Ligand binder design. Structure first.
Ligand code: KSC
Length: 273
């Protein structure tokens, strides 16, 4: 990269004021704050010694490569300890939480379909740029004050050289959200994200409910291997459920592109008003 003294993303720590802590965890904190007095930003800070700082900053570096309306935008970095990654502030927080607030509860199927399409749109850009996300799920979609959605959390996002990223055989991923090939072989492609997109669609129509209701991970694995897919969620339009099924096709290459998912969901949207 460019060194910190020539990096257009580096800002002096003084330009930032941390105002409200939104979360804390093993590897640091997330705050709402302001850049230069007036500009609302989210600030993620690294707990010294909790993890490699090269590992922490690799998220920012990848976000320098993936700039788009539909993706949470890198705002800046402070590369001295404690290391900050500063990003586009999203006023309604994560999709999984928002769908449960009183504003979320009152959204029509029309608006949920609209949101689903905005997410596919952001994933179509990622697809086109030869990236994969690997952590696609309602928890990693953020919602703006105008009820628009953006992809977030690029900690696991990877650029593909040859269609395929292969994780280490020590690597664990969430069972309900991760395509079978990635769980079984550690192999991820944009088609693994497509599968995750299908699961994410269930979280949208159930207002944030956990996938595969009443099932353990071993039950989900066993069911999938029989050829079953997730039971029809309550109140899921059958069109949307069949779209989910496409994302969950056995062979990765039979699963649709994100551009197709996008166009299909816009049609579903324009036809529900
Ligand atoms: C009710 O408390 C809250 C909680 C969260 C928010 N919004 C936000 N939550 N959040 C994060 N938390 C984790 C979430 C799962 C991804 C991480 C980052 C990098 N930005 C944000 C915002 C953001 N960009 O604004 C707002 C109010």
């Amino acid at each position: 990269q460019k060194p910190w003294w020539e990096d257009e993303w580096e800002v002096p720590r003084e330009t930032l004021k941390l105002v409200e802590r939104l979360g804390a965890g093993q590897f640091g904190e997330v705050w709402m704050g302001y850049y230069n007095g007036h500009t609302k930003v989210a600030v993620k800070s690294l707990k010294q010694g909790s993890m490699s700082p090269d590992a922490f900053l690799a998220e920012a570096n990848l976000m320098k490569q993936l700039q788009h309306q539909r993706l949470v935008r890198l705002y800046a970095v402070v590369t001295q300890e404690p290391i900050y990654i500063i990003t586009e502030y999203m006023e309604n927080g994560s999709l999984v939480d928002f769908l449960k607030t009183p504003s979320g509860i009152k959204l029509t199927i029309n608006k949920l379909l609209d949101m689903a399409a905005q997410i596919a749109e952001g994933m179509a850009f990622i697809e086109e740029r030869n990236y994969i996300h690997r952590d696609l799920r309602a928890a990693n979609i953020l919602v703006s004050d105008t009820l628009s959605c953006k992809i977030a959390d690029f900690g696991l996002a990877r650029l593909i050289e040859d269609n395929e990223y292969t994780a280490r055989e020590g690597a664990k991923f969430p069972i309900k959200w991760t395509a079978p090939e990635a769980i079984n072989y550690g192999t991820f492609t944009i088609k693994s994200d497509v599968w995750s997109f299908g699961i994410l669609l269930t979280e949208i129509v159930t207002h944030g409910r956990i996938p595969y209701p009443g099932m353990t991970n071993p039950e989900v694995i066993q069911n999938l291997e029989r050829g079953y897919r997730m039971v029809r969620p309550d109140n899921c339009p059958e069109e949307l459920y069949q779209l989910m099924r496409l994302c969950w096709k056995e062979r990765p290459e039979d699963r649709p592109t994100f551009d197709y998912l996008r166009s299909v969901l816009e049609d579903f949207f324009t036809a529900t008003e």
